[PDB]
Amino acid sequence: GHMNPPPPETSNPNKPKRQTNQLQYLLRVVLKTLWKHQFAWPFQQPVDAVKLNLPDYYKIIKTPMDMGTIKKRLENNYYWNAQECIQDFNTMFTNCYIYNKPGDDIVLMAEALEKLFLQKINELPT
Numbered sequence: 656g657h658m659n660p661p662p663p664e665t666s667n668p669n670k671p672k673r674q675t676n677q678l679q680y681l682l683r684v685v686l687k688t689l690w691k692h693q694f695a696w697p698f699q700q701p702v703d704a705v706k707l708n709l710p711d712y713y714k715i716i717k718t719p720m721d722m723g724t725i726k727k728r729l730e731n732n733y734y735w736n737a738q739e740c741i742q743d744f745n746t747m748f749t750n751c752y753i754y755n756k757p758g759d760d761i762v763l764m765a766e767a768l769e770k771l772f773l774q775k776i777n778e779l780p781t
């Protein structure tokens with residue numbers, strides 16, 4: 656039974672920044688469309704294991720990720736490569752399948768968001 660760890664870093668002000676067509680698309684298209692999905696809301700902030708009473712969440716999940724962090728990272732130009740952002744979305748879905756069980760409501764929500772994520776990433780420019 657533990658408290659929550661601090662959330663992931665969202666700004667790297669000592670690293671150089673770039674705006675690419677790919678990075679604009681990940682924020683204005685991928686993140687935006689997923690954020691407004693009917694089942695997006697549990698993924699918009701880190702898992703609060705104390706409020707939700709999940710004492711084993713951060714014993715099982717050592718690489719947590721959520722769309723609130725991804726959004727703040729894109730808004731702060733944290734990513735230099737679009738693949739770093741894609742990896743974050745993948746880690747987020749993967750954690751949900753590691754912690755939860757087949758047929759759980761949260762897993763069906765992750766499945767619906769991942770299908771939409773693949774549809775949007777399919778159309779990534781360049």
Ligand SMILES: Cc1nnn(C)c1-c1cnc2c3ccc(C(C)(C)O)cc3n([C@H](c3ccccc3)C3CCOCC3)c2c1
Pocket residue numbers: 696697698701702703707709750751754755760761764
């Ligand atoms: C767990 C888990 N594993 N991966 N993720 C992303 C989660 C995850 C992340 N955030 C929330 C979350 C945030 C706010 C609320 C509030 C407080 C407003 O009621 C409920 C929340 N639940 C629910 C839940 C609670 C406890 C155990 C499992 C599920 C889901 C919600 C969808 O409908 C089913 C219950 C979450 C589950």
